[PDB]
Scaffold this active site. Structure first.
Site, short mmCIF file in Angstrom:
data_model
loop_
_atom_site.label_atom_id
_atom_site.label_comp_id
_atom_site.label_asym_id
_atom_site.label_seq_id
_atom_site.Cartn_x
_atom_site.Cartn_y
_atom_site.Cartn_z
N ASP A 112 9.18 24.45 -87.74
CA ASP A 112 8.73 25.49 -88.69
C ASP A 112 7.70 26.42 -88.07
N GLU A 117 -3.76 -5.84 0.20
CA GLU A 117 -2.34 -6.19 -0.03
C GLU A 117 -1.90 -7.38 0.84
N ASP A 152 0.86 -1.21 0.00
CA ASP A 152 0.00 0.00 0.00
C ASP A 152 0.89 1.24 0.00
N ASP A 164 17.55 16.57 -90.92
CA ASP A 164 16.14 17.00 -90.98
C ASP A 164 15.26 15.92 -91.59
N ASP A 220 -17.91 5.06 -0.38
CA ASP A 220 -16.64 4.73 0.32
C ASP A 220 -16.88 4.48 1.82
N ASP A 248 -4.08 5.14 -5.84
CA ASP A 248 -4.20 6.55 -5.39
C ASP A 248 -3.26 7.48 -6.14
N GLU A 252 11.26 12.02 -89.35
CA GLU A 252 10.09 11.57 -88.56
C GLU A 252 9.73 10.09 -88.82
N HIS A 289 -12.81 9.79 -9.21
CA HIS A 289 -12.69 9.49 -7.79
C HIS A 289 -11.84 10.56 -7.09
N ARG A 296 -7.83 -3.93 -5.66
CA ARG A 296 -6.58 -3.15 -5.78
C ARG A 296 -5.40 -4.11 -5.90
N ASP A 298 -10.76 -3.29 -1.03
CA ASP A 298 -9.57 -2.41 -0.97
C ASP A 298 -8.62 -2.87 0.14
C1 LIG Z 1 -7.01 7.55 1.48
C2 LIG Z 1 -5.70 6.82 1.61
O1 LIG Z 1 -5.31 6.91 2.97
C3 LIG Z 1 -4.01 6.38 3.27
O2 LIG Z 1 -3.00 7.09 2.62
C4 LIG Z 1 -2.19 8.03 3.29
C5 LIG Z 1 -0.77 7.51 3.32
O3 LIG Z 1 -0.68 6.46 4.27
C6 LIG Z 1 0.24 8.58 3.71
O4 LIG Z 1 1.54 8.11 3.40
C7 LIG Z 1 0.01 9.91 3.07
O5 LIG Z 1 0.40 10.01 1.74
C8 LIG Z 1 1.47 10.86 1.36
C9 LIG Z 1 2.43 10.12 0.45
O6 LIG Z 1 2.98 9.03 1.15
C10 LIG Z 1 3.55 11.02 0.08
O7 LIG Z 1 4.45 10.43 -0.84
C11 LIG Z 1 3.02 12.25 -0.53
O8 LIG Z 1 2.44 11.83 -1.72
C12 LIG Z 1 2.61 12.66 -2.83
C13 LIG Z 1 3.34 11.89 -3.89
O9 LIG Z 1 4.62 11.60 -3.39
C14 LIG Z 1 3.44 12.73 -5.09
O10 LIG Z 1 4.19 12.09 -6.11
C15 LIG Z 1 2.09 13.03 -5.60
O11 LIG Z 1 2.16 13.84 -6.70
O12 LIG Z 1 1.38 13.73 -4.61
C16 LIG Z 1 1.25 13.06 -3.35
C17 LIG Z 1 0.58 14.05 -2.45
O13 LIG Z 1 0.38 15.21 -3.18
O14 LIG Z 1 2.06 12.84 0.32
C18 LIG Z 1 0.95 12.01 0.56
C19 LIG Z 1 -0.04 12.87 1.29
O15 LIG Z 1 -1.07 13.26 0.41
O16 LIG Z 1 -1.36 10.23 3.14
C20 LIG Z 1 -2.22 9.30 2.52
C21 LIG Z 1 -3.56 9.95 2.57
O17 LIG Z 1 -3.53 11.04 1.69
C22 LIG Z 1 -3.99 4.94 2.90
O18 LIG Z 1 -2.74 4.35 3.26
C23 LIG Z 1 -4.32 4.82 1.42
O19 LIG Z 1 -4.28 3.49 0.98
C24 LIG Z 1 -5.73 5.34 1.25
N1 LIG Z 1 -6.32 5.02 -0.06
C25 LIG Z 1 -7.28 3.89 -0.15
C26 LIG Z 1 -8.40 4.02 0.83
C27 LIG Z 1 -9.55 4.58 0.47
C28 LIG Z 1 -10.53 5.10 1.45
O20 LIG Z 1 -11.67 4.31 1.40
C29 LIG Z 1 -10.00 4.70 -0.96
O21 LIG Z 1 -10.82 5.83 -1.12
C30 LIG Z 1 -8.80 4.83 -1.86
O22 LIG Z 1 -9.23 4.81 -3.20
C31 LIG Z 1 -7.86 3.70 -1.54
O23 LIG Z 1 -6.81 3.59 -2.51
#
Ligand SMILES: C[C@H]1O[C@H](O[C@H]2[C@H](O)[C@@H](O)[C@@H](O[C@H]3[C@H](O)[C@@H](O)[C@@H](O[C@H]4[C@H](O)[C@@H](O)[C@H](O)O[C@@H]4CO)O[C@@H]3CO)O[C@@H]2CO)[C@H](O)[C@@H](O)[C@@H]1N[C@H]1C=C(CO)[C@@H](O)[C@H](O)[C@H]1O
Ligand SMILES: *[C@@H]1O[C@H](CO[C@@H]2O[C@@H](C)[C@@H](O)[C@@H](O)[C@@H]2O)[C@@H](O[C@@H]2O[C@H](CO)[C@@H](O)[C@H](O)[C@H]2NC(C)=O)[C@H](O)[C@H]1NC(C)=O
Ligand SMILES: *[C@@H]1O[C@H](CO[C@@H]2O[C@@H](C)[C@@H](O)[C@@H](O)[C@@H]2O)[C@@H](O[C@@H]2O[C@H](CO)[C@@H](O)[C@H](O)[C@H]2NC(C)=O)[C@H](O)[C@H]1NC(C)=O
Ligand SMILES: *[C@@H]1O[C@H](CO)[C@@H](O[C@@H]2O[C@H](CO)[C@@H](O)[C@H](O)[C@H]2NC(C)=O)[C@H](O)[C@H]1NC(C)=O
Ligand SMILES: *[C@@H]1O[C@H](CO)[C@@H](O[C@@H]2O[C@H](CO)[C@@H](O)[C@H](O)[C@H]2NC(C)=O)[C@H](O)[C@H]1NC(C)=O
Ligand SMILES: *[C@@H]1O[C@H](CO)[C@@H](O[C@@H]2O[C@H](CO)[C@@H](O)[C@H](O)[C@H]2NC(C)=O)[C@H](O)[C@H]1NC(C)=O
Ligand SMILES: *[C@@H]1O[C@H](CO)[C@@H](O[C@@H]2O[C@H](CO)[C@@H](O)[C@H](O)[C@H]2NC(C)=O)[C@H](O)[C@H]1NC(C)=O
Ligand SMILES: *[C@@H]1O[C@H](CO)[C@@H](O)[C@H](O)[C@H]1NC(C)=O
Ligand SMILES: *[C@@H]1O[C@H](CO)[C@@H](O)[C@H](O)[C@H]1NC(C)=O
Length: 1771
Positions: free
Chosen positions: A1440, A446, A203, A1334, A327, A542, A1337, A600, A526, A443
């Site tokens: 000619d 893993e 995850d 000439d 959700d 995500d 032809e 989503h 997933r 979901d």
């Molecule tokens: C909803 C979601 O909740 C849990 O996710 C957490 C996660 O555990 C945290 O680590 C944190 O995420 C951060 C990233 O780790 C970090 O790298 C950074 O992310 C950046 C990327 O690096 C960039 O490349 C990208 O462009 O932008 C992101 C952020 O802009 O920052 C993150 C913080 O946003 O926070 C998230 C929550 O945001 C959980 O572990 C996930 O699995 C979970 N998703 C699932 C669960 C639900 C809820 O029912 C479903 O809706 C989803 O669809 C599922 O996939």
């Protein structure tokens, strides 16, 4: 050492993948240390002491073989090495190899796959592959038998087999590798440059750091080559692993446990490899029809009311929307099987509300179950689960492992336990009874854990801390998951971790069977493993609302299609972060074409449902538009899922899966297909309104308009505004459509339709799968409809293959849309061959070639045939009855043609509607294409003139990168082929990579298409009706690339550009004064055409038979010949000049003329005696009017008898010698016909009857007698008789020599040798310098032969008479009989009928050779009759003309056309040949004629003298002035002739040759260029004293003043008094010149100069070629001077390329340098660098005119000593 002997640094296998390498670890591991290397290349690699050895031999078994392997003595890398390994290979299928490596003594973990079961069959035979096992060190090799290619080679590295470390390295045949997952790869094709990918479900967010994500996929595909041949590899291992790629190319699998269980899968195409793979792991589930619609979701709608508002808003917007997702918010405290009784009170009612509006509810379900249950607050799922003992346990195997997720502290169900499946089923049943949901979203499978391992942590074991870890995120296996020692039914978490999501999907699939009634539901997961697509759909996780994630979505989707999970997509608009309107707009556009299309949004971010952006937003309108398109095409999409489910096809497809023959598709990842038929081109960049996209080699139609695009096998810039995505339909496919609605429920009640996209052969095929759309196992239970659609020959076949399902909605096909068709007419519908009473309406758009057929009712579930006729538009009509007489409705229908008495002028009444020939056996090789053409309609072919040919062969040869040939001929019978040799390469060089063109052979009708690769423009298309190939009648037509065509000759054209408006021109050599639509002296079946973008090409038809060409306004050109074969040569350009250089390379470069032949020339028909020539010579000399060549017409001959001297010209020999002594040159005229009526000795006839040189009748062998110039001896020729009476009473009988014959050639050379040196009287010798041949032809003054006349009327009056002059008189009109026989050099007999137009050509070369022999100098030949390649030895005059005003512009057009024909030395008779000259006309013609390459004043007998010394002194001054100008420019003109001879440049040039970009120059024929730099603008009208001339965009200087008129791209009226001709020099050029004199002999002794015309940048370039001006082969024998001259930064430099002519003993004296455009600043100093000496010359600078004149006459400077000239301006 020899152990370390690795040939190639790229073949090193990293021995220390687990840490940074040191020589210390490399020494302990027994490997090879070498820190020499590039970036990323290993420093510690394996030796050959590592690996296993085969012990014994390969014992054979029922399915394959088994081998025992012992480990080689090497140090252990990670401990616990398995010493004894067993290899069990199996040949399961003709295209599937399986082998497995395991321990021999102990049993190890093997994946319990639900679908893949142990193989019990026997070995298959035959196989498409071979397997080779090497004994020491052990290695396995899989080879494709058909081509002996090695697909799978395990020798590149050692087999490593330990308890917690397994490795196998495989060398691959190519670097085209696809697959491996789950990862963000960023591109579709893998980067094989030392990249390692971890595989372990986890995850984490997908972000492009190369981490492991939610699933585990070990399969990859490899495309061997452009044949399509492909193979795949699949490793069945669920343990944590990594895959390393290297640039060998090679792939290395490194796993932490289990066994090495490999599958090698072979296929002829990428798709077949995928099919083989999916048949082994499990075919994808067929989704419910409603799941193909659009889905909406958010994490945290918060309350039920907020969710309802979103639903209502989007409904109100009428957006296509079918599924709502709920959700974890709906749940009670994030607990499953519950809903929150406060914030989500009424949740069941919402489900009902969705259903009443045809929408569906998908609920989320998490694996983790809250452990928080007490008697006061029971939690049923936990209590029932605990009672069943179905949890994942701690290492003790009894205590449930405690983790943490959304509901706090949780237990994890063991889905590998069958009791767990029962529990899971029951839980879904109780909750479904409360909330009526339609699908399940699983979901966190893993399985995810918010802590590491457990709440209590993980034990210190080798499972939690293995000796090797595979580069997984965070560096421990139990991070954000369960402890690896946790126990499940299938085994330890260490082994089954990657199977958790897979196992849950299986359990859920089982639950659905019980909860839903006979209904296939929908499962979205997933976490995935190989075989998960058989149960569930997948989303890419995500993502974030960024442009990178948008871009990454496409390769992700494509890979999952490979993995057998086609229902896949990314979260539209991004899950994390706030989206912008633009990002969300361009994502909704592409997202509409995801197989799984869902928006989503994540918690705490700005709303992003489409209706949120406003009811009139561009985003909402765009979303609604492309989602509606998606809904229209759902029947098509659904059928694709059927093919995926039934056969294993991919739904979203890569371009290489359909177009693997082009290597420009092997790396395309920003575009994709739905199936084979729909190309999707999205905008993936911020702010972009244009995309660079590749369009594959197919016919493509714009989806929205239906029009055909002109792109094919080219990169294009596509204009895609903010509301537009690129959608294109491939030709050859039929698309089932359905009228869209807001839901799939509503749409399925609407009528169906077909889009028929036709291909090159006018054919298409399609399929339609149709079922209930919901029921389970509708395919195995066979409850469905299957249709196959096919269109051929204007007939649609609707065929049912299966009909066991009846749709309750009475659906019908109501509309048929046909793309790329002509207007359909008389549409007839039949139902099992019974006519249906229906009168279909046809709407047609002629511009787009799109037809809509409506008011048809084809009931779903029945068979139909729909047939239609096509209407031909007047512009596309081809004359079916071009005959001279016999046109009528009756005779037209007899030919199988259609008759319509239309009124449009030019359009034919009788035109073709059907084809006579069919094409088969179309083969495309590396250097060409071949095809068989067979007569189908014998009866109708026989109604056309002459007998049809049954079998024909089409041969296309790719000679060079810019030249090809296509030939159509009779393979069974030798037919006449033109015996004119052409220059083609000995070995073809049109390599696919370098060549400028593509060739396509089309059917229905037969056609050859040639396209320019760079722009995709079709320059030749023969797919028109009319192709006929009869014995004496062959017709072929082509479509023209534009309305700009130049060429065809020889005739008097009205303009340089052709009028393509229903005009026919005949070609057959004839003595005819040039006229409108009249065949003249020569035949040039060659044209140059300009494409709309300004690119140019040329086409030659090598045929000598009588022919005509017709031009229609389509634009199209038709050729109609009376014999021979069809032999076409195509030149690709892309420039008008490059076309002529290519053309002349093929046919031969123009002859190099002597310097004196560029002087002015005088001739008259009717000199009375030698004294008249002497008087004219003296008068010219007295008047100081320069002239170099004097001619004599047939007057110097006795009674016009060739090779005789008239008494009236007894003094002519002495006169010749006298003129020559003063530097003059003489040319004599020779006629080909020899008199047979001489009474006194006439050596020519007697010695030719002895040698047998004359043309004779085919078999009897009598001479074919004609009449031309010789008179009868001893008669009195009255000069007052009419032409007809003189031919019948005074003209003698003459015999025509056959110049193809060896004997004729010998006899002709002897007669010319004795004319030069008289063998008898050595005083009557005529010391000529060139020859004028000439009347060749050949021309006769009788028709056929002296009366009785001709014999064979079949050849003289042919079945088809071309549009020739005197068409009713036959081919023999004014010429010899066609039955006359001629003999080729090899002895073969030919008819005059075939070689007539080659007569002059055949005489030219022998004449040229004898002249160079008798004179010892190069000489000059001028002929009247010419054929392609005639310019290699002669010049040509335009015949000619008449003393009239229109004839001056006609001369300019003729000279420009002969320049395209490769004849550089041309001109017209100055002042006209026929009729009396008028003073003013003659004056203006002298001014124009002074700039002809061949500049001759010639007059007819009887008329007034028109020579310069025949008028008055005003004329003498005009003539002298303009001719002095000419003689000044001869060095420049001579250099141009050199360049023509050596490079194939043109001397006389149309403006479009140098300014093709200006389209104003495409219609100019009243001005011309000499070479690139000298513009001539003559007055061609009477009384005019001004001329309106166009000046192309360049700096132009007045030749006489040196001042630049400022006219760039403008018209300008220029002063043109009677004594003035307007001449201009283009800036950027240096022109050599020399001081004029009486003739070239004296002029060449004078000083030479340069006119330097600077361009805007102050630069100029030019050339000088110089030799003795008369010797043979001066350039070939290396006796010449060649130099280039350049000016930059106020310095003129000389660069001598070659010099073995100009020397101190033979100096060329430099006298004058004139520099134009030097600027207004004063010039202070001028210096010349010469022979290491500085000379300060005399110079004058005029600041007003900006002209610098430098005089070096005092410095005695020879040109070969001149190095540089520098001038410096005043600061
Ligand atoms: C909803 C979601 O909740 C849990 O996710 C957490 C996660 O555990 C945290 O680590 C944190 O995420 C951060 C990233 O780790 C970090 O790298 C950074 O992310 C950046 C990327 O690096 C960039 O490349 C990208 O462009 O932008 C992101 C952020 O802009 O920052 C993150 C913080 O946003 O926070 C998230 C929550 O945001 C959980 O572990 C996930 O699995 C979970 N998703 C699932 C669960 C639900 C809820 O029912 C479903 O809706 C989803 O669809 C599922 O996939
Ligand atoms: C060479 O010929 C000239 C020109 O001949 C005249 O014009 C011819 C076209 C034809 O019509 C002839 O019959 C003519 O005689 C001769 O010069 C002419 O001579 C006559 C006297 O005999 C005289 O009256 C004319 O003025 C002359 N014409 C011109 C134009 O000068 C000349 O005599 C011939 N020379 C020799 C050596 O015989
Ligand atoms: C260039 O010439 C035009 C046309 O001149 C007439 O046509 C010629 C072919 C010739 O026959 C001349 O003698 C004619 O005069 C000039 O335009 C004419 O100018 C006169 C003078 O006023 C006027 O009466 C006419 O109507 C004009 N005719 C046309 C057709 O325009 C023109 O002025 C000249 N160009 C320049 C710039 O000098
Ligand atoms: C939910 O699971 C947790 C963890 O197993 C249970 O809580 C532990 O209970 C013991 C007593 O049996 C306490 O000493 C611990 O402090 C608790 N764990 C932690 C980490 O604080 C809890 O009993 C379970 N709830 C139930 C079964 O209702
Ligand atoms: C040379 O001949 C020309 C034409 O015959 C003479 O020019 C013509 O002269 C008349 C008057 O005699 C004018 O009306 C015409 O317009 C002129 N025509 C032109 C210019 O083509 C010219 O004068 C003669 N020159 C002489 C006798 O030396
Ligand atoms: C003029 O002639 C010179 C040689 O004297 C040409 O020089 C060569 O140009 C090519 C490119 O066209 C270079 O690759 C060669 O290295 C050049 N050779 C030398 C000796 O310099 C030159 O191209 C010609 N054109 C002009 C006007 O400069
Ligand atoms: C070029 O320079 C030469 C000197 O080398 C000039 O020649 C002299 O010109 C004058 C004036 O006509 C005569 O008196 C001399 O007899 C000439 N001498 C020679 C050597 O011929 C010549 O005029 C100059 N040319 C131009 C066009 O300016
Ligand atoms: C030439 O023809 C004319 C015209 O008929 C005639 O008068 C004359 O006598 C002829 N000359 C001869 C035959 O001497
Ligand atoms: C012709 O040119 C000469 C020489 O320049 C000159 O004397 C004469 O006046 C000019 N004009 C005529 C009609 O002779």
């Amino acid at each position: 050492s020899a152990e370390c002997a690795v040939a190639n640094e790229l073949e090193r296998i990293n021995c220390i993948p687990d840490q940074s390498p040191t020589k210390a670890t490399c020494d302990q591991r027994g490997c090879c240390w070498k820190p020499q290397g590039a970036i990323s290349v290993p420093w510690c690699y394996y030796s050959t002491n590592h690996g296993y050895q085969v012990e014994g031999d390969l014992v054979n078994t029922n399915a394959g073989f088994t081998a025992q392997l012992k480990r080689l003595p090497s140090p252990s890398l990670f401990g616990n090495d398995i010493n004894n390994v067993l290899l069990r290979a199996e040949y399961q299928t003709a295209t599937r190899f399986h082998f497995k490596l395991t321990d021999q003594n102990q049993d190890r973990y093997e994946v319990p796959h639900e679908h893949v079961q142990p193989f019990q069959g026997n070995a298959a035979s035959p196989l498409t592959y071979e397997v080779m096992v090497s004994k020491q060190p052990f290695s396995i090799k899989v080879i494709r038998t058909s081509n002996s290619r090695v697909l799978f080679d395990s020798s590149i590295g050692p087999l490593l087999f330990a308890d917690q470390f397994l490795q196998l390295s495989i060398r691959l045949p190519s670097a085209n590798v696809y697959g491996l997952g789950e990862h963000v790869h960023q591109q579709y094709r893998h980067d094989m440059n030392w990249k390692t990918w971890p595989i372990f479900a986890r995850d984490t967010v997908p972000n492009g750091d190369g981490n492991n994500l939610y699933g585990a996929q070990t399969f990859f595909l490899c495309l061997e080559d452009a044949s399509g041949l492909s193979f795949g590899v699949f490793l069945m291992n669920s343990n944590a692993m990594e895959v390393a790629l290297q640039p060998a190319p090679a792939v290395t699998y490194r796993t932490t446990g289990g066994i090495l269980d490999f599958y090698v899968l072979l296929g002829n195409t990428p798709e077949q490899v995928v099919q083989e793979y999916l048949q082994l792991i499990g075919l994808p589930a067929l989704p419910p029809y409603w799941a193909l619609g659009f889905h909406l979701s958010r994490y945290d709608y918060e309350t039920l009311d907020n969710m309802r508002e979103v639903v209502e808003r989007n409904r109100a917007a009428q957006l296509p929307y079918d599924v709502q997702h709920a959700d974890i918010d709906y749940m009670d405290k994030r607990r499953d099987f519950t809903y929150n009784p406060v914030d989500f009170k009424g949740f069941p009612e919402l489900a009902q509300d969705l259903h009443n509006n045809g929408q569906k509810l998908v609920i989320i379900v998490d694996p983790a179950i809250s452990n928080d249950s007490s008697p006061s607050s029971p939690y049923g799922p936990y209590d029932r689960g605990s009672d069943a003992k179905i949890w994942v346990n701690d290492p003790d195997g009894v205590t449930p492992l405690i983790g943490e997720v959304w509901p706090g502290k949780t237990v994890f169900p063991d889905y590998t336990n069958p009791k767990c499946t029962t529990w899971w089923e029951n839980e879904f049943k109780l909750f479904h009874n409360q909330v009526d949901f339609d699908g399940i979203w699983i979901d966190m499978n893993e399985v995810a854990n918010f802590v590491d391992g457990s709440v209590s942590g993980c034990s210190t074991s080798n499972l939690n801390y293995p000796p090797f870890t595979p580069r997984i995120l965070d560096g421990y296996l139990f991070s954000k998951t369960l402890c690896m020692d946790a126990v499940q039914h299938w085994g330890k978490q260490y082994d089954v971790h990657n199977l958790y999501g897979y196992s849950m999907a299986i359990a859920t699939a089982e639950a659905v069977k019980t909860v839903f009634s006979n209904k296939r539901s929908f499962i979205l997961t997933r976490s995935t493993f190989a075989g998960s697509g058989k149960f569930a759909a997948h989303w890419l996780g995500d993502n974030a609302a960024t442009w990178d994630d948008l871009r990454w979505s496409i390769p992700g989707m494509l890979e999952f299609n490979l993995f057998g999970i086609p229902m896949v997509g990314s979260d539209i608009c991004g899950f994390l972060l706030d989206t912008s309107e633009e990002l969300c707009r361009r994502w909704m556009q592409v997202g509409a074409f995801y197989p799984f299309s869902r928006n989503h949004n994540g918690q705490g971010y700005k709303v992003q449902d489409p209706a949120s952006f406003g009811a009139d937003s561009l985003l909402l309108n765009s979303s609604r538009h492309y989602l509606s398109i998606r809904y229209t095409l759902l029947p098509y999409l659904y059928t694709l899922f059927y093919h995926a489910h039934s056969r294993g096809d991919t739904v979203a497809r890569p371009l290489l899966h359909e177009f693997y023959e082009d290597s420009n598709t092997w790396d395309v990842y920003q575009q994709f297909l739905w199936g084979p038929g729909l190309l999707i081109t999205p905008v993936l960049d911020e702010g972009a309104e244009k995309v660079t996209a590749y369009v594959p080699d197919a016919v493509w139609y714009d989806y929205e308009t239906g029009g055909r695009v002109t792109w094919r096998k080219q990169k294009v810039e596509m204009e895609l505004p903010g509301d537009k995505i690129g959608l294109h339909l491939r030709g050859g496919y039929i698309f089932p459509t359905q009228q869209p609605a807001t839901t799939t429920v509503a749409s399925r009640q609407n009528p169906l339709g077909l889009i028929i996209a036709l291909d090159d052969n006018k054919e298409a095929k399609g399929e339609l799968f149709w079922d209930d759309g919901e029921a389970k196992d509708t395919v195995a239970n066979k409850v469905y409809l299957l249709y196959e659609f096919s269109v051929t020959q204007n007939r649609l076949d609707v065929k049912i293959l299966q009909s066991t399902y009846t749709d309750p909605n009475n659906l019908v096909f109501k509309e048929i849309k046909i793309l790329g068709t002509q207007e359909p007419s008389n549409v007839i519908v039949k139902q099992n061959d019974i006519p249906v009473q229906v009168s279909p309406n046809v709407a047609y758009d002629s511009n787009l070639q799109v037809a809509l057929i409506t008011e048809i009712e084809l009931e779903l579930g029945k068979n139909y045939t729909v047939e239609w006729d096509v209407k031909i538009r007047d512009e596309e009509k081809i004359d079916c009855y071009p005959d001279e007489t016999g046109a009528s409705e009756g005779n037209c229908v007899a030919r199988g043609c259609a008759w319509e008495a239309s009124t449009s002028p030019g359009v034919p009444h009788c035109y073709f509607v059907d084809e006579l020939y069919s094409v088969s056996d179309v083969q495309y090789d590396s250097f060409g294409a071949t095809a068989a053409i067979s007569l189908k309609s014998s009866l109708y072919a026989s109604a056309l003139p002459s007998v049809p040919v049954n079998s024909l062969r089409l041969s296309v040869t790719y000679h060079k990168e810019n030249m090809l040939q296509f030939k159509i001929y009779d393979p069974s019978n030798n037919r006449y082929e033109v015996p004119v040799p052409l220059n083609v390469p000995r070995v073809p060089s049109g390599t696919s990579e370098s060549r400028l063109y593509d060739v396509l052979i089309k059917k229905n009708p037969f056609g050859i298409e040639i396209r320019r690769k760079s722009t995709g423009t079709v320059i030749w298309d023969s797919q028109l009706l009319g192709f006929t190939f009869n014995d004496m009648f062959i017709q072929i037509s082509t479509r023209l690339p534009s309305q700009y065509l130049y060429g065809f000759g020889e005739t008097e054209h009205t303009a340089f550009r052709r009028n393509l408006n229903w005009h026919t021109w005949g070609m057959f050599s004839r003595d005819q004064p040039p006229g409108y639509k009249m065949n003249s002296y020569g035949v040039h079946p060659y044209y140059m055409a300009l494409e709309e973008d300004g690119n140019a090409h040329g086409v030659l038809l090598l045929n000598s038979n009588a022919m005509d060409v017709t031009f229609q306004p389509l634009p199209a050109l038709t050729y109609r010949t009376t014999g021979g074969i069809l032999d076409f040569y195509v030149l690709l350009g892309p420039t008008p000049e490059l076309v002529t250089q290519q053309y002349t390379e093929l046919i031969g470069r123009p002859v190099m003329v002597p310097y004196w032949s560029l002087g002015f020339q005088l001739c008259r028909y009717g000199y009375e005696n030698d004294s008249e020539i002497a008087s004219l010579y003296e008068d010219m000399v007295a008047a100081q009017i320069p002239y170099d060549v004097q001619y004599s017409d047939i007057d110097y001959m006795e009674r016009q008898l060739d090779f005789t001297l008239s008494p009236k010209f007894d003094g002519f020999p002495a006169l010749i010698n006298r003129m020559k002594a003063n530097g003059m040159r003489v040319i004599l005229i020779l006629d080909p016909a020899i008199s047979g009526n001489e009474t006194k000795p006439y050596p020519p006839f007697t010695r030719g009857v002895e040698d047998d040189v004359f043309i004779k009748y085919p078999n009897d062998g009598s001479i074919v007698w004609g009449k031309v110039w010789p008179d009868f001896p001893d008669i009195f020729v009255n000069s007052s008789l009419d032409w007809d009476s003189q031919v019948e009473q005074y003209r003698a009988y003459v015999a025509f020599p056959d110049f193809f014959r060896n004997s004729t050639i010998t006899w002709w050379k002897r007669e010319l040798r004795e004319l030069y040196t008289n063998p008898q009287d050595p005083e009557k010798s005529l010391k000529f310098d060139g020859m004028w041949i000439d009347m060749n032809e050949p021309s006769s003054f009788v028709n056929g032969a002296v009366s009785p006349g001709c014999r064979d009327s079949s050849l003289n009056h042919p079945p088809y008479m071309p549009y020739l002059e005197s068409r009713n008189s036959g081919l023999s009109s004014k010429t010899l009989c066609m039955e006359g026989e001629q003999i080729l050099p090899d002895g073969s007999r030919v008819r005059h009928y075939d070689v007539h137009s080659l007569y002059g050509w055949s005489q030219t070369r022998p004449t040229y050779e004898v002249v160079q022999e008798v004179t010892g100098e190069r000489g000059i030949i001028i002929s009247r009759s010419t054929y392609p390649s005639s310019g290699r030895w002669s010049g040509h005059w335009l015949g000619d003309n008449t003393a009239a005003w229109d004839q001056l512009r006609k001369s300019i057009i003729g000279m420009m056309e002969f320049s395209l024909f490769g004849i550089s030395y041309t001109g017209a008779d100055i002042c006209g040949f026929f009729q009396d000259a008028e003073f003013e006309m003659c004056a203006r013609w002298m001014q124009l004629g002074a700039f002809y390459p061949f500049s001759r004043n010639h007059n007819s007998i009887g008329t007034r003298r028109q020579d310069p010394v025949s008028w008055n002194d005003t004329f003498v001054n005009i003539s002298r002035s303009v001719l002095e100008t000419r003689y000044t420019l001869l060095p420049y003109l001579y250099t141009l002739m050199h360049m023509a001879h050596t490079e194939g440049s043109t001397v006389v040039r149309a403006l479009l040759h140098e300014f093709v970009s200006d389209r104003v120059t495409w219609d100019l024929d009243s001005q011309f260029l000499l070479g690139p730099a000298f513009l001539v603008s003559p007055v061609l009208e009477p009384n005019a004293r001004n001329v309106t001339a166009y000046f192309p965009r360049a700096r132009w200087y007045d030749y006489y003043t040196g001042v630049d008129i400022n006219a760039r791209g403008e018209w300008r009226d220029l002063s043109a008094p009677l004594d003035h001709i307007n001449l201009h020099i283009r800036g950027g050029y240096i022109l050599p010149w020399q001081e004029p004199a009486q003739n070239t002999y004296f002029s060449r002794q004078k000083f030479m100069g340069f006119k330097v015309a600077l361009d805007d940048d102050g630069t100029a370039e030019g050339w000088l070629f110089w030799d003795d001006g008369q010797s043979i082969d001066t350039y070939e024998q290396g006796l010449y001077y060649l130099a280039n001259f350049s000016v930059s930064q106020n310095t003129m430099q000389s660069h001598v390329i070659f010099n073995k002519y100009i020397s101190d003993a033979n100096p060329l004296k430099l006298g004058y340098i004139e520099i134009w455009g030097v600027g207004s600043a004063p010039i202070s100093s001028v210096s010349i660098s010469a022979s290491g000496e500085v000379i300060t010359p005399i110079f004058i600078h005029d600041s007003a005119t900006q002209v610098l004149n430098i005089n070096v006459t005092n410095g005695n400077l020879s040109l070969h000593n001149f190095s540089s000239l520098t001038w410096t301006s005043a600061p």
